[PDB]
Amino acid sequence: QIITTDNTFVSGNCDVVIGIVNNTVYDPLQPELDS
Amino acid sequence: QKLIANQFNSAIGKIQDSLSSTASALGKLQDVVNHNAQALNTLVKQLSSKFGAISSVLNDIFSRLDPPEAEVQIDRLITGRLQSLQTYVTQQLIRAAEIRASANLAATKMSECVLGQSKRVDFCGKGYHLMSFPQSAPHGVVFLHVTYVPAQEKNFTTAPAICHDGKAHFPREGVFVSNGTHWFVTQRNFYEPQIITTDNTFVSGNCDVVIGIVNNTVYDPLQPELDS
Amino acid sequence: LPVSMTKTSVDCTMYICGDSTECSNLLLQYGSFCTQLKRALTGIAVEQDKNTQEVFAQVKQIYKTPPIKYFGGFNFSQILPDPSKPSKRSFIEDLLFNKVTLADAGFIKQRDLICAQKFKGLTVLPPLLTDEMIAQYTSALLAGTITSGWTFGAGAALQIPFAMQMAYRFNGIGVTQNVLYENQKLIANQFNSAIGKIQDSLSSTASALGKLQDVVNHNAQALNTLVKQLSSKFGAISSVLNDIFSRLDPPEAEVQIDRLITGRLQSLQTYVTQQLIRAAEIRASANLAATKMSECVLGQSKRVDFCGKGYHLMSFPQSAPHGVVFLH
Amino acid sequence: ASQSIIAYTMSLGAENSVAYSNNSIAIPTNFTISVTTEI
Ligand SMILES: *[C@@H]1O[C@H](CO)[C@@H](O[C@@H]2O[C@H](CO)[C@@H](O)[C@H](O)[C@H]2NC(C)=O)[C@H](O)[C@H]1NC(C)=O
Ligand SMILES: *[C@@H]1O[C@H](CO)[C@@H](O[C@@H]2O[C@H](CO)[C@@H](O)[C@H](O)[C@H]2NC(C)=O)[C@H](O)[C@H]1NC(C)=O
Ligand SMILES: *[C@@H]1O[C@H](CO)[C@@H](O[C@@H]2O[C@H](CO)[C@@H](O)[C@H](O)[C@H]2NC(C)=O)[C@H](O)[C@H]1NC(C)=O
Ligand SMILES: *[C@@H]1O[C@H](CO)[C@@H](O[C@@H]2O[C@H](CO)[C@@H](O)[C@H](O)[C@H]2NC(C)=O)[C@H](O)[C@H]1NC(C)=O
Ligand SMILES: *[C@@H]1O[C@H](CO)[C@@H](O)[C@H](O)[C@H]1NC(C)=O
Ligand SMILES: *[C@@H]1O[C@H](CO)[C@@H](O)[C@H](O)[C@H]1NC(C)=O
Numbered sequence A: 001q002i003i004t005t006d007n008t009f010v011s012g013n014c015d016v017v018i019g020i021v022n023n024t025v026y027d028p029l030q031p032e033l034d035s
Numbered sequence B: 001q002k003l004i005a006n007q008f009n010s011a012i013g014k015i016q017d018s019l020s021s022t023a024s025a026l027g028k029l030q031d032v033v034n035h036n037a038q039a040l041n042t043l044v045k046q047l048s049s050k051f052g053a054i055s056s057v058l059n060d061i062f063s064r065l066d067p068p069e070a071e072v073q074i075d076r077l078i079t080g081r082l083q084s085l086q087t088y089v090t091q092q093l094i095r096a097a098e099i100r101a102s103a104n105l106a107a108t109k110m111s112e113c114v115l116g117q118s119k120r121v122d123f124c125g126k127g128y129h130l131m132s133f134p135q136s137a138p139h140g141v142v143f144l145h146v147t148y149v150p151a152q153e154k155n156f157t158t159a160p161a162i163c164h165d166g167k168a169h170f171p172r173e174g175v176f177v178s179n180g181t182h183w184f185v186t187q188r189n190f191y192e193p194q195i196i197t198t199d200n201t202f203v204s205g206n207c208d209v210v211i212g213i214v215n216n217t218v219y220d221p222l223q224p225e226l227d228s
Numbered sequence C: 001l002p003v004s005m006t007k008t009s010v011d012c013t014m015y016i017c018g019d020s021t022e023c024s025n026l027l028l029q030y031g032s033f034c035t036q037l038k039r040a041l042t043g044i045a046v047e048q049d050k051n052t053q054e055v056f057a058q059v060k061q062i063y064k065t066p067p068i069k070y071f072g073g074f075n076f077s078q079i080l081p082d083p084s085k086p087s088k089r090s091f092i093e094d095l096l097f098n099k100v101t102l103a104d105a106g107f108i109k110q111r112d113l114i115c116a117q118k119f120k121g122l123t124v125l126p127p128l129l130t131d132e133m134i135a136q137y138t139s140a141l142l143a144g145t146i147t148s149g150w151t152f153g154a155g156a157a158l159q160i161p162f163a164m165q166m167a168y169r170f171n172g173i174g175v176t177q178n179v180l181y182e183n184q185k186l187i188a189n190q191f192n193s194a195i196g197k198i199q200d201s202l203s204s205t206a207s208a209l210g211k212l213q214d215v216v217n218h219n220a221q222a223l224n225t226l227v228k229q230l231s232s233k234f235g236a237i238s239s240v241l242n243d244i245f246s247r248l249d250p251p252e253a254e255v256q257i258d259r260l261i262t263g264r265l266q267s268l269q270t271y272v273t274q275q276l277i278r279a280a281e282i283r284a285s286a287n288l289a290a291t292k293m294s295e296c297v298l299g300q301s302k303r304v305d306f307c308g309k310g311y312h313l314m315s316f317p318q319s320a321p322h323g324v325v326f327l328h
Numbered sequence D: 001a002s003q004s005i006i007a008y009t010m011s012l013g014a015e016n017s018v019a020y021s022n023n024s025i026a027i028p029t030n031f032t033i034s035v036t037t038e039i
């Protein structure tokens, strides 16, 4: 499944995890953010 | 991760110091040999008993007494040694039942703690069972129970739910605490405070049914991105 | 669940010999029987205290109760110890101690009682842990279970409100926290009405504590069938030791007294074998009781029918004579 | 100095008193990984 902010959670910055990989997280609000 | 690895290595390195000293760590495996050797040394010492006869040796009876009267005293030794062997076999059967009852517990522990994670309290260590590492032992097995022991506690002021707009907000997987001024949401086993939002809590009911409810603002990640 | 047994010590020269004859010199012809019997009996006596140390000595910190007793509407007055009674027991444990009719050695002075089997060489050893120490282990477990939850059995004692502790324990069975906080008074009244019917269910039917009465009945029946074998002659002329010496004469006296000595040694070996079988049964029962204590009192078990009939929430231990009583 | 055999009452453990309250919970900030030997 796509990383869509409902399957993950945010905790701290990305400099303490050993072995992190840069990728994008798809916010499911901004496509539907017409207002 | 590095603190966890350092604590894990320092907890492994103390098992060597605890097993190199104190001289009585592997006592349960020593008693199994020390009971069988004692039961065998009792068996070799009951051959020196006469059991009501004139001699314990079987050779100086038939060359001493005649075929008829020799029998009365040969049977006295035979029924004594057979009773001793019967007592030894009965005690060995009881000890084998004890070793079977211990080996079944060891097999269930090897199944539930080495091959997986057990939720049973104090089954595989004093604490939250993380891992189990078996090691080879003479006439037994030795488990290394990796546990999770909490430390450095801190006491705050708690509440069951939060009143935002006349609605009760109960935590999903956390608990409300307070450092005196603000209120947060925190995991039950580690102090990690977070802002009380709509994703951490759920709405069920109103503000007059919960005994001990408090007042705070429940945040939401939509209305900051909706007003602008 | 039975935990411990009555410890017994057997003397050979008072049971086999009549404690006044010269048959002790004939007892050395058999050899090392009595050393093996005393070693097995002392092993049983050590294991009967090891069972109590494995069941009741779970925690190492004696936890106490607060003086003001409010836990969200719940009434623990039947499981907490009563300070009015000098035994420092609860209102339930007194009913558990007044139902098991064993021979208590609490009498100060010392027409005969059932303890006249000591004169035949059958003594009773007192346990290492007294009842006032089991009642303090039970109080230390209850004051940890009520005030802390499962945290006192897995590390440091972390305090929690009991209304939030039961809301924690409802989440482990699949029920959300909103059911408790809207119906807390009904839950507290149901808990009080269920604890109040425990003493009414124990004061009736006369067989609620039969598993603790059966071990005392077996310990009495073994001693009774051990003192009843002393009147048996095993095929000889009489069961009296000096009557054989007074009736007959040396050559045929020893052919008629070895039949008694071997029979008494066989009866003692039978008693030791049956006590060893009963010790294995009670050791298995004590291991089961310690596992039940660790998995239901010191935590919440998701096992089916292990901590009661239903979805297990909490368990409370009670001190019992030669056993333990759980409130699931 | 003078070693001798002494008799005493068996101690059950330390006397602890958990500070229970209606609005007080305790959450730890650290942890300790311990290895326990079971033979
Ligand atoms: C993940 O992304 C960050 C940010 O884009 C990267 O950090 C940059 O790395 C380059 C190359 O070393 C540097 O020139 C920049 O100065 C860095 N920027 C910052 C803000 O640190 C990082 O290297 C990326 N990691 C991977 C594995 O691709
Ligand atoms: C309770 O926690 C809050 C949040 O961490 C503290 O509020 C912060 O306090 C620091 C220091 O005074 C300020 O720099 C921040 O701007 C504050 N943040 C917010 C959102 O107010 C608060 O001080 C803590 N209270 C106590 C008594 O420790
Ligand atoms: C939480 O907020 C509510 C209001 O939303 C408080 O209820 C008020 O209590 C005062 C004092 O008795 C009354 O005069 C008001 O009429 C109440 N308002 C309503 C709307 O009922 C409540 O007391 C607050 N709780 C705490 C602990 O501060
Ligand atoms: C907890 O339960 C006990 C037992 O029902 C209560 O004790 C009774 O209280 C009533 C009310 O005064 C008396 O009439 C009875 O005589 C008491 N019985 C006994 C055996 O003491 C006790 O009050 C309850 N406590 C709470 C806080 O509800
Ligand atoms: C021991 O003797 C004293 C005085 O003779 C008496 O008061 C006490 O009760 C006796 N104790 C036992 C256990 O017989
Ligand atoms: C809170 O924790 C501190 C430090 O452990 C302790 O001194 C204090 O008594 C505790 N108070 C309560 C109410 O638990």
Ligand SMILES: *[C@@H]1O[C@H](CO)[C@@H](O)[C@H](O)[C@H]1NC(C)=O
Pocket: C068, C070, D020, D021, D022
């Ligand atoms: C908890 O609330 C009850 C009822 O108001 C009160 O009697 C008790 O003292 C409170 N407990 C504490 C520790 O304040």
Ligand SMILES: *[C@@H]1O[C@H](CO)[C@@H](O)[C@H](O)[C@H]1NC(C)=O
Pocket: B003, B152, D029, D030, D031
């Ligand atoms: C936790 O304990 C370790 C070792 O005692 C220490 O290095 C670390 O700083 C502690 N962490 C906190 C947050 O106190």
